[PDB]
């Protein structure tokens, strides 16, 4: 029938780690400079979102590291 | 007939802590950086999902102790 | 004939609270990393799985304890 | 007569998973769209739904490892 | 008699992705502008619908690729 | 019968952006005065409720330019 | 039945902007008098309080500004 | 049916950073100058309204050296 | 025998939008002023309350509007 | 003897979608603006009923379209 | 039997705006001047409550007026 | 024989409606204060309780309406 | 036989409003002093439950005013 | 039963503005001296909590004259 | 059978007012210097748990005055 | 034969609210405790279990008092 | 046969109460611990769960105060 | 069982105010040399912590005092 | 059959409390010096974490305390 | 199945005590030097973030002094 549950779930994450998920990295800092202006700036705002796109590009390394093997 | 019960639950146990398994860690940990950004950072949602890992992957040392043989 | 009832009921909780119970606790303590990402983490979710092993392995001292003899 | 058992078991298995399953994905994946607006979005939600579309599909890898042969 | 059940639900698909989808898209919009008046404004509301319609509309090239062939 | 679907959404956009819609912007431009005075005057209170106008207004732009058609 | 929803917003509108509204603006700037005796007097103060009553008042052409119509 | 999600997170892109942004510009600049008279003059305000628009345009920039490649 | 079943709706709306419905409208702007006092005031609550007795009273223009005739 | 049964289906679906389905339109929305009072406001109430309006009326539409002839 | 359901409401808005409500004004302005004393004093508190009981006194006249008859 | 049936209808109505009524009324609004404390008060308990009182008491009034006669 | 239902329902209000009734009012002041230490002090929890001791008490006024006889 | 509720508000305001709410004023008091010591002396603190008195004692006069009547 | 409902919540109020609640009292007052340390002091805080200590005990006064008899 | 049935229900409510009856009491306050920990701490949980105790024992005086007579 | 069943609630009580109720207890602390790291530290926290052994623990003395008897 | 409850809180009492809390005292005096250099030094400051420790120790004192009797 | 369960419970006591209890520790203590920089350092967040290692270890010594036993 | 988790939570200590640490205290000293331009220089926050520094690295130590083994 269908393809094994291992190779779908490969699917999602190619798919976010993708084109898809560079253009989302450009649209969480838009909105960083968005915030600044109209409003007040700070380092704790700035830090949160570019943490984010640490934690989610290259996830595959922290679950391989997490694990310890794959 | 089919094999006995011990050895079907055995192997639901194997598939889910295999190579599916490690691919469902990297999909959570993406799920804390797409929160993070478009959103608000906290220690506590980064703190449940992690710990959710560690208890998830070796829950088989987690039940040998529990019991307490095996 | 056949042999007693008071053996078949014997043979029915030695393999519950054999291996095949074991590798029962094993996949409740999975269901709970699983539900912790992808979702909410809460104490209640944890104790009441946890409460559940406590229950279920060990039965005999509890049957023994509440009807005082045996 | 007609033909066995066996064949006509399998005939479902081929509908289901054939075009007529593929188009349900898509229904599936719509409803996730269709439901975060005009409400509220969660990761709950949209894990649960894409969950089922693992399960369903590639069911028969999942019956051949659980049952152990085929 | 009545055409194949394959033929129906692709029939729902074009129905729901068609005129009647793109009018459901600027309602969606239209509860964002008028939830930040008359309350509170957050990056949280607006991505939630704006992900929707993303999911929603298009959702045949995400059922693909998840499922691997059609 | 009754007329299709797709009308029926247009009579919403049409009701909300005509000149019920026009009334309300007029209320929120209201509510930012009133809360200057008796109250706090900030950058954030007055962008939040004018961007709202801005993306409930010509909702229909944004969404043919999400969608790409239309 | 009762009268169409696009007369109800035209009397509160007509209400707000009223003698209701005229005496609100008595109240506001008493506050401002009130608070630079028996404290500190500044001018973002009173540019906040005056700045809402432009707001406030002839909020209607603000709207008219905004939209392009009406 | 629909585009690929690709495409439409690319038009967000491309309508933020058009014609749109750049009148977003002037309109956190005059804020300044608002500011600055009826008030107090400082560096920081300016700053951080001018480190707003460095990070909103040009944030494709910020992306592709973050991540690495694109 | 009895009306027909058109007539027996009409008296329904008939009584809810007559009498009963302005002492209606009353109750629940006297429930705004009770919860302004003894609690938080804020413009969520009230834009709600005002915006019910809209859609209530004069909710056959509503329909009307909606389906397109009568 | 009596009409056959085609035309006895026909005059229940006349009979619902005629003077008789209208004053239910109104009587649903009414329900609307009487819950918000009251109660809660929220976007997923407003949604369901408004919706329902849409599936009901101009439900021939609906199953022609689905059918695929007609 | 009983009176009927427009008379008993009437009677609901009697008692709340008769002398139970007068003896709620005077409980309200309490809280004040005790909020004021073990705190801090703030122009949006006493604005709230104030504005609370305009609101709820008089609701008659703010109905009438809104409805557009009575 | 016995009285008409129509008569005995006619008693069940003046019983519920007398005395025993009015004391069932005294006990439905007892519930709502024993409810508030030990517990949460909200307007959606006490708006349920009352509008029931105001459906039971002159229920005869309503169903006159709504039957058009009698 | 036994007595009639009027008097049954008289009983429970008698008990319900005599000294049981006044050893719950203490106890509901009760848990306001707890819940003020170890936690937080607000204005809607003491409201609430000395609103419900109002409620509650003399409830047979409340039903004979609302009823409008008796 | 109980006494009517118009009653049981008039003992609120009776015990608060009574000799419990007389030592209040003098706790108040004290709390200005003490914090003008070992700490930072302002017009704007005594200010505050002797306005505070003023408004809390003496509120039935405050409530007569916005009201209007009593 | 058992003692009337009457003694028993007479024996909570015993309770709660004796010896467990002067014990109850010392932890509250504990917890406010804990809390001036490693923290913020302000006079909000104390107030609040002296606030409560005085409405938890001698609870049953305030019960008979706001009752009116006891 | 055998004894009245008016002994033998006499002879059930002595053993329930007997020693039997004593020992549920403790088992139901323990669940309180249970449940505060591993959990959340609600003043309705404590208030529920502790009325149905105030219920259970001394439902004599309670049926005496709601019969009339015994 | 069995022993009556005053003895067997004695039973669950003295397990519950005994060296299985003293490992809950340390168990509840550990919990609190872990939630104030890798969250946020409250008052109310901690006294919840202080606040459950205390009424699990001792419970005997509690149900024979408010019975008033064994 | 279990001591009774009052036993329980005496215990807390003695653990918070024995070694435990003397050593509680000098962590909090070290904060304030720690605070006035790398920082500002302040009257404010100091009075606080200091405050704190009085409350803290000896509340047993204060808690009878206000109590008036134990 | 398994083992009893005061067994069970030591186990995950010894578990938690054990190597992995420690390596718990220096990740609390590594968020607070992530949270100092790109952020606000106070002495409250510091306390608060410091203070649930010193809860959460020697938990069985806090236990024996508050019980009095074991 | 997976490794137990004393070497997963290992392995975070790793990573973030590794390279990955060491770069994010470059990224905390150039927000020292970024921050001291436009803008205000103190000793406050030079002190919190280098202070910082040295509690997120080398917490083992600070670990094991507080446990007082390892
Ligand atoms: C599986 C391996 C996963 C590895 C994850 C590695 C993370 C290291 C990353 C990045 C550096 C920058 C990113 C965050 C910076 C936050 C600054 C901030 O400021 O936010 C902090 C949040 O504190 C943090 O989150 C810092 C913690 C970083 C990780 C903690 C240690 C590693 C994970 C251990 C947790 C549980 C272990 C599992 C147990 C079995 C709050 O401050 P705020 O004022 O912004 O609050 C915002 C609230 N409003 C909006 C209302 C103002
Ligand atoms: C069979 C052996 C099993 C061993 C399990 C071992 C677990 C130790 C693990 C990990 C460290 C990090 C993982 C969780 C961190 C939570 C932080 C947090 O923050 O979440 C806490 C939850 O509190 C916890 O769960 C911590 C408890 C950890 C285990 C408790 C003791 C061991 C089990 C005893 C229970 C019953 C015993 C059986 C009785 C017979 C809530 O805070 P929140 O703001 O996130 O709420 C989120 C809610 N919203 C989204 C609305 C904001
Ligand atoms: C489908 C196409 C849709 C296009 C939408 C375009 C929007 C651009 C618009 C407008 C300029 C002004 C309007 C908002 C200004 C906020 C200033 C402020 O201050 O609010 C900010 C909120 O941050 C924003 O929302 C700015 C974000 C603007 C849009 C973000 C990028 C575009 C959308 C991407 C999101 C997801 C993409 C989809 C992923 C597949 C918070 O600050 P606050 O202090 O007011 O917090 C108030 C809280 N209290 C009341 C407690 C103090
Ligand atoms: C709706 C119509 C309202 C009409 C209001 C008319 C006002 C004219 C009045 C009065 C003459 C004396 C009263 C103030 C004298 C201040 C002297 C002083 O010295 O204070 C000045 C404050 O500057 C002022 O406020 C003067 C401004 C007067 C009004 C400005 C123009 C009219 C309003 C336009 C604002 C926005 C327009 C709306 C935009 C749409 C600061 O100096 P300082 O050393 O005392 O700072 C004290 C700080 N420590 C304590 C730390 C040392
Ligand atoms: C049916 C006809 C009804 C007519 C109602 C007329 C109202 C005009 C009244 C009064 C003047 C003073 C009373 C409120 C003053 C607030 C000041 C304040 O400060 O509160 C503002 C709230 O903003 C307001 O509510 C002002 C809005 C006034 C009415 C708005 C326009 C009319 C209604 C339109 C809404 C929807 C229309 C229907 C659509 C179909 C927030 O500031 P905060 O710092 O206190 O936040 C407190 C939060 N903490 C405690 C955490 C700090
Ligand atoms: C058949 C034709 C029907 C026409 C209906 C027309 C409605 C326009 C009306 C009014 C202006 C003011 C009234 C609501 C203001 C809400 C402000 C607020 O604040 O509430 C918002 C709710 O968002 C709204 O509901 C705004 C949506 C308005 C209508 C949406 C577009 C039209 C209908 C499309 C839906 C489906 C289409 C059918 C698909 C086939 C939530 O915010 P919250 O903080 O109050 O949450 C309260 C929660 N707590 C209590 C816990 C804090
Ligand atoms: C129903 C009838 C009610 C009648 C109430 C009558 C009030 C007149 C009373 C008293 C004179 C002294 C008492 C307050 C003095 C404040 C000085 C101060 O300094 O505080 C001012 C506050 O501004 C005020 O509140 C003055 C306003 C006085 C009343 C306003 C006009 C009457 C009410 C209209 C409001 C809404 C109308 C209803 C709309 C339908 C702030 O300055 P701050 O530095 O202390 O800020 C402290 C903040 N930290 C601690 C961080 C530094
Ligand atoms: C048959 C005659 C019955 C007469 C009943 C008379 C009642 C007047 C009484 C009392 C003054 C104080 C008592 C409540 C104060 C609430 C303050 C508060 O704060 O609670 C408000 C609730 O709003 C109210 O309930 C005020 C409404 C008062 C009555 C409304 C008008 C009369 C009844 C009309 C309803 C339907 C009519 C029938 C239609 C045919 C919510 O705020 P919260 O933050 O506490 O939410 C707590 C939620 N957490 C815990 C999560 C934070
Ligand atoms: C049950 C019996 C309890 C007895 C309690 C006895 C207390 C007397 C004690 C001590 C002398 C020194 C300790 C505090 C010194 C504060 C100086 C300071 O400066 O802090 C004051 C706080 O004002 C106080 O708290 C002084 C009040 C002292 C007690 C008040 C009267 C007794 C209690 C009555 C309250 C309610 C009665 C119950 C009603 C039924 C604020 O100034 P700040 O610049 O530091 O603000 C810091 C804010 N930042 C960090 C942003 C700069
Ligand atoms: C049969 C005899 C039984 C005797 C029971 C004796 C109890 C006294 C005990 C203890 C002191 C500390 C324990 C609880 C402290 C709560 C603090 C807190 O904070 O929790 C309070 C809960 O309010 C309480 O439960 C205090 C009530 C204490 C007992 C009430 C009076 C006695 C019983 C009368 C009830 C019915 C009588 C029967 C009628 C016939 C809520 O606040 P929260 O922010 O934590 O909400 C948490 C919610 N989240 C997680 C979302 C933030
Ligand atoms: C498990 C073992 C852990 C050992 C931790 C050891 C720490 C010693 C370290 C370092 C020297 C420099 C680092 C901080 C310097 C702060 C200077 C400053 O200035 O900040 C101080 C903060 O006061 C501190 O935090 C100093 C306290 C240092 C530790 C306290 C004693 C040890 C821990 C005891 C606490 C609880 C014990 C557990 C109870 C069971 C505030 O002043 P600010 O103007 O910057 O406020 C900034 C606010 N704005 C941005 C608005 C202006
Ligand atoms: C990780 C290694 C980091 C190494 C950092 C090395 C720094 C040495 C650098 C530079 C020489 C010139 C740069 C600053 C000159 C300030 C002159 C001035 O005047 O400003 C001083 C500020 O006092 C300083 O900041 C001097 C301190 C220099 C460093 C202190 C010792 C090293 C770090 C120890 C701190 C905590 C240790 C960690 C504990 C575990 C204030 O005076 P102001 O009138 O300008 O006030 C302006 C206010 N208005 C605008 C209102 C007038």
Do not use: E
């Not at 798919?15 to 560079?22: E, K, R, S, V, Y």
């Not at 989610?56 to 679950?63: D, H, I, K, R, V």
């Amino acid at each position: 029938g269908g393809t094994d549950p291992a190779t779908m779930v490969n699917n999602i994450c190619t798919f976010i780690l993708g084109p898809f998920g560079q253009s989302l990295a450009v649209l969480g800092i838009v909105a960083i400079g968005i915030s600044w202006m109209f409003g007040r700036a700070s380092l704790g705002l700035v830090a949160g979102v570019v943490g984010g796109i640490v934690i989610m590009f290259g996830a595959s390394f922290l679950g391989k590291t997490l694990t310890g093997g794959g």
